[PDB]
Design a protein around this ligand. Structure first.
Ligand SMILES: O=c1c(-c2ccc(O)c(O)c2)coc2cc(O)ccc12
Length: 275
């Protein structure tokens, strides 16, 4: 599949940088014809077949195809795609309230505040998993607030760079995200499905409640070893006044066997979440 090959700057003016990763940089932008604002994600293309810098066209095409399916209040949307020889440029919905990660660094949250975010995250993941879309990169840096200066911020899930459609219940590729948030099946290079996202949600929930990361080691590999062993515990110093039901929620997500792990539907019916 090919994308619009006109110069993006003939149609948009760019502004503040919103994020910068390994192969992508995201810039605030404004469409000339409408005055409407977006976020332009510039993704570096691979320059040769066997190269290791940049993103493969197959990977970019998968990301675009997935993004095109999405319309939901808690998930980022795609407006337009441009390309040239160097980059593919995704014109994405603008979310201007910054990362949940940076937000958490200001405020630990109360259980009510934690569930305020969690419920939106769960609604967004429910949508994705209903479409057999596994995100595979759920973490606080990939949850964006619309407005961080309101008591109950609205959020959107971003970054579909590792997302996959799971049409056979499981998938077997090179997929591997951030050690603190990856499920044991990813660590052990086993077939992956929708369940891996649910583990990541357990990790996110632990962090929201405590301000600490449950599996974090001194190095990348030690974190990975902790994940595979399910080496975590609820520190009394952090959880002494947290409800046992909140711990129960996390406990049913941080489960090594993906088939024993709570599904997105289970999590929405869990007594801690369910109204
Ligand atoms: O994708 C993003 C990122 C982003 C955050 C961290 C990264 O490492 C990265 O490469 C990109 C930040 O702000 C955004 C705002 C949007 O409206 C859409 C997408 C993004």
């Amino acid at each position: 599949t090919v994308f619009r090959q006109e110069n993006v700057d003939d149609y948009y003016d760019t502004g503040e940088e919103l994020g910068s990763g390994q192969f992508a940089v995201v810039k605030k932008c404004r469409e000339k014809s409408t005055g409407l604002q977006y976020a332009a994600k510039f993704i570096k293309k691979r320059r040769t077949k066997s190269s290791r810098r940049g993103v493969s066209r197959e990977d970019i095409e998968r990301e675009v195809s997935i993004l095109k399916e999405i319309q939901h209040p808690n998930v980022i949307t795609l407006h337009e795609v441009y390309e040239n020889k160097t980059d593919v440029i995704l014109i994405l919905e603008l979310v201007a309230g910054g990362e949940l990660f940076d937000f958490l660094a200001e405020k630990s949250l109360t259980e009510e505040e934690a569930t305020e975010f969690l419920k939106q995250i769960l609604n967004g993941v429910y949508y994705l998993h209903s479409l057999q879309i596994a995100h595979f990169d759920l973490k606080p840096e990939n949850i964006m607030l619309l407005d961080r200066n309101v008591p109950k911020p609205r959020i959107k899930i971003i970054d579909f760079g590792l997302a996959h459609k799971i049409d056979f219940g499981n998938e077997f590729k090179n997929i591997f995200g951030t050690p603190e948030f990856v499920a044991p099946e990813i660590v052990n290079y086993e077939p992956l499905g929708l369940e891996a996202d649910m583990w990541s949600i357990g990790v996110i929930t632990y962090i929201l409640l405590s301000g600490a990361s449950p599996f974090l080691g001194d190095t990348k590999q030690e974190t990975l070893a902790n994940v595979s062993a399910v080496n975590y515990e609820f520190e009394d110093e952090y959880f002494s006044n947290t409800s046992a039901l909140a711990k129960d929620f996390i406990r049913r997500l941080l489960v090594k066997d993906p088939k024993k792990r709570m599904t997105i539907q289970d999590s929405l019916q869990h007594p801690w979440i369910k109204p």
